[PDB]
Design a protein around this ligand. Structure first.
Ligand SMILES: [Zn+2]
Ligand SMILES: [Zn+2]
Length: 79
């Protein structure tokens, strides 16, 4: 464990907090339409594949891989 993260600081430039985890992003990242995510979180939510090239889909306010997304957008409906 690190048990660090020390350093007193006042105001700070606004950062696009990731959606998957929920933490202020810094540096390289994947900016979504109206949302923001990390360069590693951008991966699918079901399995976790790099949607960098493949791409991400919108289902129930979530992101998945065409492989999973298609299955969700097409099929049953979980209340
Ligand atoms: Zn994240
Ligand atoms: Zn998936």
């Amino acid at each position: 464990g690190s048990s660090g993260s020390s350093g007193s600081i006042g105001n700070a430039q606004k950062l696009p907090m990731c959606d998957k985890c929920g933490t202020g992003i810094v540096g390289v990242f994947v900016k979504l339409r109206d949302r923001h995510r990390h360069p590693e979180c951008y991966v699918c939510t079901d399995c976790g594949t790099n949607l960098k090239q493949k791409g991400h889909f919108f289902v129930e306010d979530q992101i998945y891989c065409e492989k999973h997304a298609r299955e969700r957008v097409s099929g049953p409906s979980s209340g």
